[PDB]
């Protein structure tokens, strides 16, 4: 399934580098907008993933202050970006939709 | 040496080492409220003096 799949993934990797959050050492889930679903998922993160999220964001804000980026060696590789928050967020959303479905009857 | 010390000696000796000098700060623990270094440095002089 290489022909058509790799072209789509090729455009996604293009956009990933164009977005440029990897240039500050960040991962995709570090950039999501914090709404109530996201605050709960972050709350549910285990100790290590929470502490890693804190330092990466702190390192990126420090760079943004200095208008700098990391050296190219330290950029977040597209293939190594871990969606550590997505599974927690999916459950938080699934729970809220259950409440909403019960609130309808 | 202690008897030589009076209030003037303390004001002169302390100003020599404290007043408008850059301190070294070390913080450990829940230190979010630890003041910024500039604010600490500004605490080493008095605008009124």
């Amino acid at each position: 399934v290489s022909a058509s799949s790799r072209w789509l993934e090729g455009i996604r990797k293009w956009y990933y580098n164009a977005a440029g959050f990897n240039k500050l050492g960040l991962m995709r889930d570090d950039t999501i907008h914090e709404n109530d679903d996201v605050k709960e998922a972050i709350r549910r993160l285990p100790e290590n993933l929470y502490n890693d999220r804190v330092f990466r964001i702190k390192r990126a804000l420090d760079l943004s202050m200095r208008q700098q980026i990391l050296p190219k060696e330290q950029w977040t590789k597209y293939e190594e970006d871990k969606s550590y928050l997505e599974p927690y967020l999916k459950e938080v959303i699934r729970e809220r939709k259950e409440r909403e479905e019960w609130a309808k009857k | 040496r202690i008897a030589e010390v009076d209030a003037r000696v303390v004001r002169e000796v302390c100003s020599k080492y404290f007043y408008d000098q850059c301190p070294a700060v070390a913080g450990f623990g829940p230190i979010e409220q630890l003041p910024d270094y500039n604010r600490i440095r500004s605490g080493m002089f008095w605008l009124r003096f």
């Binding site: 909403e100 609130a103 309808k104 009857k105 | -």
Partner: protein, 49 residues
């Protein structure tokens, strides 16, 4: 914002439609009264003066 489409929410709207209808009469009469709206007040019996 699809979550407000359900049997409970349409029972809730049905309970509050008599009240909202009446607050429309309050505002309508209040607007006609405060502005001396001749287009409507010519039809009221005793007001005609």
């Amino acid at each position: 914002l699809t979550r407000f489409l359900g049997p409970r929410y349409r029972q809730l709207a049905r309970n509050w439609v008599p009240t909202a209808s009446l607050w429309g009469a309050v505002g309508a009469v209040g607007l006609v009264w405060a502005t001396d709206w001749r287009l409507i007040l010519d039809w009221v019996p005793y007001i005609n003066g």
